[PDB]
Design a protein around this ligand. Structure first.
Ligand SMILES: [Zn+2]
Ligand SMILES: [Zn+2]
Ligand SMILES: [Zn+2]
Lengths: 149, 143
């Protein structure tokens, strides 16, 4: 009879292979890696993900912010570097990902995507908020932090 | 609120868990397996022997893959496990793979369910049923 391990952890989907991983709440800054494919789970970077990974990632214990974008759209192209800067800023608090709605045509209907770039904030399988239209990194960070508060 | 002895259904190790934190995803301090998963663990006779004695009720599906009603019952037993998460832990044991366990539990027909708590048999049922019915039965035996 020994004590059980009671340290809180967060369910994170690996954005590279889709594996459900558990990360100690105190190791968010330790560069944890997926136990299956080795990909960093909290990189502060933007992963381009597919519809299967997206459906899994929406259910995570750490908030997920997704840029629904398409390369033919000028504002989406301009937004890409802004979204990368937001990711660096939000590293450890929110994970950022993007999904090309031209490459993956069924995702738009599933999330009632309207104008693009569209940003949806997910947490534990719920959509917390959304915004659409290109904007500076800091404005998006502010919007996100406001919704998490 | 009290502390509960739970058998790790993976490693067999006796773990102590506060009763108020059963939803906190406690892990076996040896092997690291989640102790309260809300899922069905396929266990062996050694682990079963220990887990019968736990402070949280344990419901065991005695099954075999050759049995059509058992195959049908499997996803119903998984549904029951989700519903009962934190109240009752669910496990199954393959009586074909482990051919002595059924005799040792006076099991005839399968699927058969035995509800254990602190080394006592609380209840027994035999034959496939919907998840809602099994959950209802088990909850009734616990109050
Ligand atoms: Zn991975
Ligand atoms: Zn263990
Ligand atoms: Zn027994």
């Amino acid at each position: 009879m020994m004590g059980a391990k009671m340290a809180e952890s967060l369910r994170l989907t690996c954005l590279a292979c889709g594996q459900a991983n558990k990360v100690p709440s105190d190791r968010l800054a330790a560069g944890p890696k997926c136990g299956i494919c080795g990909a960093g789970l909290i990189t502060g970077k933007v992963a381009g993900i597919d519809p299967a990974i997206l459906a899994r990632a929406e259910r995570d214990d750490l908030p997920l912010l997704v840029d629904f974008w398409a390369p033919w759209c000028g504002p989406c192209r301009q937004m890409a570097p802004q979204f990368q800067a937001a990711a660096a800023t939000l590293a450890g608090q929110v994970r950022l990902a993007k999904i090309d709605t031209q490459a993956h045509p069924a995702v738009a209907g599933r999330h009632r995507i309207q104008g693009i770039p569209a940003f949806i904030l997910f947490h534990k399988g719920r959509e917390l908020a959304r915004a659409a239209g290109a904007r500076p990194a800091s404005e998006l960070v502010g919007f996100v932090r406001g919704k998490l508060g």
